[PDB]
Amino acid sequence: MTEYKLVVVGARGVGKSALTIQLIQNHFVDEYDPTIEDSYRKQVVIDGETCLLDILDTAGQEEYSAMRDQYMRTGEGFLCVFAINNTKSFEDIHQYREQIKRVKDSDDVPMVLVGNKCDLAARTVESRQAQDLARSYGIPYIETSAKTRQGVEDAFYTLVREIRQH
Amino acid sequence: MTEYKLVVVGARGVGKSALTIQLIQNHFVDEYDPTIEDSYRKQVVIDGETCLLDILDTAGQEEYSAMRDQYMRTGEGFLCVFAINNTKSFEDIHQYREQIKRVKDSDDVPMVLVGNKCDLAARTVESRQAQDLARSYGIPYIETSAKTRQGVEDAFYTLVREIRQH
Ligand SMILES: Nc1nc2c(ncn2[C@@H]2O[C@H](COP(=O)(O)OP(=O)(O)NP(=O)(O)O)[C@@H](O)[C@H]2O)c(=O)[nH]1
Numbered sequence: 001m002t003e004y005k006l007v008v009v010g011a012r013g014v015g016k017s018a019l020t021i022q023l024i025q026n027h028f029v030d031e032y033d034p035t036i037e038d039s040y041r042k043q044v045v046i047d048g049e050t051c052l053l054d055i056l057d058t059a060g061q062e063e064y065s066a067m068r069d070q071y072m073r074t075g076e077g078f079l080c081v082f083a084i085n086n087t088k089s090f091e092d093i094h095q096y097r098e099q100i101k102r103v104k105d106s107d108d109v110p111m112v113l114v115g116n117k118c119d120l121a122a123r124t125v126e127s128r129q130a131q132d133l134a135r136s137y138g139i140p141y142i143e144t145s146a147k148t149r150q151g152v153e154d155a156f157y158t159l160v161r162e163i164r165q166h
Numbered sequence: 167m168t169e170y171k172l173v174v175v176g177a178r179g180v181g182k183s184a185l186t187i188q189l190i191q192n193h194f195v196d197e198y199d200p201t202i203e204d205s206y207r208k209q210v211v212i213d214g215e216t217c218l219l220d221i222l223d224t225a226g227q228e229e230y231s232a233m234r235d236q237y238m239r240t241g242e243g244f245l246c247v248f249a250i251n252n253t254k255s256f257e258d259i260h261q262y263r264e265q266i267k268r269v270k271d272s273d274d275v276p277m278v279l280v281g282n283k284c285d286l287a288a289r290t291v292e293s294r295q296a297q298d299l300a301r302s303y304g305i306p307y308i309e310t311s312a313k314t315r316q317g318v319e320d321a322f323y324t325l326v327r328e329i330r331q332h
């Protein structure tokens with residue numbers, strides 16, 4: 001069966017891991033637990049197609065430097081996550097989209113911008129902003145909450161449909 | 167606020183109206199009730215954006231002939247629905263995509279192919295088929311069930327994100 005290699009990337013603390021365990025295991029991890037690397041394989045059905053989700057959950061920042069090049073070379077689609085109450089992580093999005101284009105040797109790579117933690121009142125990143133950014137890349141923008149589970153299947157399934165269309 | 171004019175089109179009996187009332191009013195209409203024209207406005211929030219859903223539910227076939235030209239001129243995005251146990255309605259999809267391109271004077275109009283009634287065992291339209299078709303148009307394919315509500319928010323929200331990107 002068709003597998004889709006996907007990698008979840010973005011800055012630390014934005015909820016990369018909370019989105020992935022809400023999808024795989026259906027529950028909210030409200031813990032403090034920084035990732036080095038976690039990989040997850042889940043056999044799923046999407047738009048009637050049998051497929052395997054081979055997800056790679058990554059570390060926000062650290063001595064993952066050019067050392068990101070390796071997963072970025074092999075992931076077919078990317079979730080670029082920032083958090084809606086963290087302006088720095090939204091500004092850091094640029095840096096990841098450029099390194100991904102730099103290793104994949106292309107200007108169109110399957111991607112979706114994910115504005116996580118949409119359940120929190122007190123956001124510092126408005127959606128106009130994050131929509132126009134998504135618009136400038138020709139990339140989808142979707143808001144999520146790993147707490148409510150609002151938007152999480154939609155962000156992962158949209159990205160599969162982006163790999164499917166490339 | 168931003169409104170999105172959307173029109174739901176396709177052959178009779180495929181569940182155009184069942185998808186729309188499952189979205190607007192949250193419940194399954196298992197009745198027999200052919201549509202002439204129904205319009206629905208629902209103020210919603212999508213990816214943090216406040217917007218109004220102005221949906222037009224149409225008649226499958228009938229003396230809506232060139233008489234479709236009128237709604238097709240004004241809808242910004244289209245849901246092209248067939249039913250997964252009805253081969254004729256899937257084959258009829260071609261006919262609507264061509265009349266829509268003919269009145270909008272373009273080759274790219276926001277659209278998503280919707281394979282409804284995915285809850286029924288005994289399908290005559292496989293998803294490979296419906297995926298490759300969607301692939302040939304540069305259009306998304308999504309499966310739904312207005313009975314289970316499986317896929318219905320996803321099909322309508324994807325299409326808004328298609329108007330947003332045009
Ligand atoms: N309120 C709220 N908190 C969330 C949400 N998603 C994640 N969090 C919280 O944010 C914190 C960090 O989450 P985690 O999922 O570990 O983030 P990460 O992006 O994987 N961090 P790291 O880069 O180190 O791997 C946790 O306390 C977690 O519960 C959300 O949707 N809303």
Ligand SMILES: Nc1nc2c(ncn2[C@@H]2O[C@H](COP(=O)(O)OP(=O)(O)NP(=O)(O)O)[C@@H](O)[C@H]2O)c(=O)[nH]1
Nearest residue numbers: 178179180181182183184196200201226311312313
């Ligand atoms: N099992 C099943 N039946 C469904 C589903 N969606 C619609 N139906 C059924 O299909 C029949 C016709 O549905 P309706 O929504 O009226 O279809 P329409 O496409 O709007 N017909 P018309 O072109 O005349 O307007 C009804 O008996 C309805 O409940 C679905 O998801 N699964």
Ligand SMILES: [Mg+2]
Nearest residue numbers: 016017034035
């Ligand atoms: Mg983590």
Ligand SMILES: [Mg+2]
Nearest residue numbers: 182183200201
């Ligand atoms: Mg109807």
